[PDB]
Amino acid sequence: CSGNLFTQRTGTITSPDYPNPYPKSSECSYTIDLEEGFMVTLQFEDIFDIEDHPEVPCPYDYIKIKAGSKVWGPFCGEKSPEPISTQSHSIQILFRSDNSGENRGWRLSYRA
Numbered sequence: 001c002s003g004n005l006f007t008q009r010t011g012t013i014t015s016p017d018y019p020n021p022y023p024k025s026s027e028c029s030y031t032i033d034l035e036e037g038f039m040v041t042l043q044f045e046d047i048f049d050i051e052d053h054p055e056v057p058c059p060y061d062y063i064k065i066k067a068g069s070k071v072w073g074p075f076c077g078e079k080s081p082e083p084i085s086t087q088s089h090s091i092q093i094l095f096r097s098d099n100s101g102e103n104r105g106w107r108l109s110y111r112a
C-alpha cells in the first residue's frame with residue numbers, strides 16, 4: 001500500500017482491502033501526479049471508518065493529504081471530511097494505522 005503513482009486524471013483510491021478491515025500496522029502512501037495546470041478535487045465516497053482516540057485528535061490511525069504547502073488532516077472517525085479542492089496537479093496522501101481495533105477505512109475518488 002506504498003508506492004502507488006496515479007497518473008490518470010480521474011480515479012479511485014482506497015485503504016487496503018476496503019471495505020474489509022484495513023491491516024494493522026499500516027504505513028501507506030499514494031501520489032496523484034498529473035500534468036501542470038490540472039486541478040484535483042478529492043471526494044470521499046461510501047463509508048468512512050478510521051479509528052479515533054479519546055485523548056488526542058487522530059494520533060495513530062489517520063489519513064492526511066498534502067498539495068504544495070497545503071496539508072489537510074489528519075482525519076479519522078466515522079465521518080469523512082467534505083470534498084477538498086486541492087488546486088493542484090500533485091497530491092500526496094498517507095494513511096497510518098496501529099495494532100489495535102478493526103475499522104474498515106476509506107474510499108476516495110479524485111478528479112481533474
Ligand SMILES: [Ca+2]
Binds near residue numbers: 024025026027
Ligand atoms: Ca507496518
Ligand SMILES: [Ca+2]
Binds near residue numbers: 097102
Ligand atoms: Ca487501529
